[PDB]
Design a protein around this ligand. Structure first.
Ligand code: SF4
Ligand SMILES: [Ca+2]
Length: 222
DNA sequence: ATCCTGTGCT
DNA sequence: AGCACAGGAT
């Protein structure tokens, strides 16, 4: 696989098209983390004002850690999935109490926190700390399944481990955050669930699904 | 190594 | 009423 050329085309596209979303204002692991939790459950159009309101109320990890659960829930109200904010709240309290108030940059340690799974670990650590971990969410699974014609069920850990291995092989190690962000952004804007915009895709020349005319059949979910 | 869960959609 | 979605699940 011509990974360097792929990285060039993907990252050049990302340089031009990257959305100036609120959670991209800085690289605070706390803020990235909050935005990833919101985006896991809610459309970007709705997350935008909730994120700003949430971070206004709780600007830093310690601010959230120290807030009463009532205040946290009030800030979440309208987003639903309240157990997921309760878990975030417990996790940042644990960060304050056992991890010096700093999000661990060890994927293993960060993963032990309540609610924190492989994707959240990869997103937060690569975006905020530049740790070369894969950040494979639904968007990335769709992009990789198409590029590499992966027809395995994406609900399976074996399939996700394969996607993880692909990212580790093709990642731009000089900027893992940008690389991971770019794959997610491509999935959001171009390589969409239905009718992907293949004709204006920056990595079309690399894509096996486009070449075979089966992009809309991918990814495979049982 | 999942399959479960809250949610939205039709 | 039943299905799709989307990640973490121990
Ligand atoms: S060419 Fe189409 S299917 Fe392939 S990655 Fe680009 S948008 Fe996705
Ligand atoms: Ca975990």
């Amino acid at each position: 696989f011509p990974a360097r050329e792929f990285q060039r085309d993907l990252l050049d596209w990302f340089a031009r098209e990257r959305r100036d979303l609120p959670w991209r204002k800085d690289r605070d692991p706390y803020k990235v983390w909050v935005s990833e939790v919101m985006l896991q459950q809610t459309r970007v159009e709705t997350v935008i004002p909730y994120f700003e309101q949430f971070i206004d109320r709780f600007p830093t990890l310690e601010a959230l850690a120290d807030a009463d659960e009532d205040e946290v829930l009030k800030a979440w109200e309208g987003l639903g999935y309240y157990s997921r904010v309760r878990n975030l709240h417990a996790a940042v309290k644990e960060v304050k109490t056992r991890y010096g108030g700093k999000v661990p940059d060890d994927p293993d340690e960060f993963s032990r926190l309540k609610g924190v799974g492989p994707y959240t670990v990869g997103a937060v650590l690569s975006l905020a700390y530049g740790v070369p971990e894969p950040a494979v969410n639904g968007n990335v699974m769709r992009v990789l399944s198409r590029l590499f014609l992966v027809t395995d069920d994406i609900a399976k850990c074996s399939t996700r481990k394969r996607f993880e291995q692909i990212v580790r092989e093709i990642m731009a190690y000089e900027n893992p955050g940008a690389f991971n962000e770019a794959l997610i952004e491509l999935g959001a804007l171009v390589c969409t669930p239905r009718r992907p915009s293949c004709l204006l895709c920056p990595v079309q020349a690399y894509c096996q699904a486009f070449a075979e005319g089966v992009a809309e059949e991918l990814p495979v979910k049982m």
